[PDB]
Tab-separated table of C-alpha atoms in Angstrom:
chain	number	residue	atom	x	y	z
A	1	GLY	CA	8.333	-14.075	17.631
A	2	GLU	CA	6.505	-11.734	15.249
A	3	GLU	CA	4.834	-8.623	16.686
A	4	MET	CA	5.760	-6.005	14.073
A	5	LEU	CA	2.939	-3.901	12.623
A	6	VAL	CA	2.606	-1.603	9.619
A	7	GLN	CA	0.473	1.367	8.586
A	8	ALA	CA	-0.955	2.378	5.197
A	9	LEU	CA	0.396	5.616	3.697
A	10	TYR	CA	-2.471	6.130	1.189
A	11	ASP	CA	-5.872	4.702	0.173
A	12	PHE	CA	-6.261	1.370	-1.654
A	13	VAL	CA	-9.212	-0.570	-3.105
A	14	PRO	CA	-8.267	-4.081	-4.301
A	15	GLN	CA	-10.992	-5.282	-6.667
A	16	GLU	CA	-9.289	-8.672	-7.141
A	17	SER	CA	-9.639	-11.491	-4.616
A	18	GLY	CA	-6.626	-12.818	-2.698
A	19	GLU	CA	-5.598	-9.248	-1.819
A	20	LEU	CA	-6.173	-7.551	1.547
A	21	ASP	CA	-8.486	-4.518	1.494
A	22	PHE	CA	-8.176	-1.503	3.827
A	23	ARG	CA	-8.109	2.328	3.725
A	24	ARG	CA	-5.852	5.181	4.855
A	25	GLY	CA	-5.564	5.196	8.663
A	26	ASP	CA	-5.693	1.378	9.000
A	27	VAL	CA	-3.004	-0.601	10.871
A	28	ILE	CA	-2.056	-4.257	10.191
A	29	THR	CA	-0.233	-6.819	12.347
A	30	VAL	CA	2.455	-8.535	10.242
A	31	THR	CA	2.058	-12.247	10.987
A	32	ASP	CA	5.291	-13.086	9.109
A	33	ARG	CA	7.720	-11.853	6.416
A	34	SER	CA	6.774	-14.118	3.504
A	35	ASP	CA	8.624	-11.888	1.014
A	36	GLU	CA	10.667	-8.672	0.829
A	37	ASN	CA	7.956	-6.924	-1.236
A	38	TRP	CA	4.825	-8.716	0.018
A	39	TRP	CA	3.748	-9.373	3.609
A	40	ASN	CA	0.795	-11.097	5.276
A	41	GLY	CA	-1.215	-10.123	8.345
A	42	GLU	CA	-4.658	-9.705	9.886
A	43	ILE	CA	-6.855	-6.637	10.418
A	44	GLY	CA	-9.900	-7.010	12.685
A	45	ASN	CA	-12.273	-9.262	10.706
A	46	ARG	CA	-10.250	-9.836	7.516
A	47	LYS	CA	-6.744	-10.940	6.511
A	48	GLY	CA	-4.549	-11.430	3.435
A	49	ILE	CA	-1.308	-10.387	1.740
A	50	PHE	CA	-0.428	-6.775	0.900
A	51	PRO	CA	2.394	-4.826	-0.813
A	52	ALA	CA	5.226	-3.854	1.566
A	53	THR	CA	5.982	-0.650	-0.402
A	54	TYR	CA	2.413	0.554	0.285
A	55	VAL	CA	3.019	0.472	4.060
A	56	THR	CA	5.561	1.752	6.584
A	57	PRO	CA	7.112	-0.199	9.516
A	58	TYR	CA	5.430	1.421	12.531
A	59	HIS	CA	6.861	1.209	16.065
A	60	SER	CA	5.943	-2.184	17.566
């Protein structure tokens, strides 16, 4: 039962692999709460982990 989603507060451009890329205005569906500072989710055609401090818990 995971339906929570988050929203980016600023821009980000991960040049390393294993990170999830996106830009300001993007929304991500949190698939699970792997960590307290890192979460995982999917966004349209790509997925990966991202920093939890970089996002805000939007209203599911």
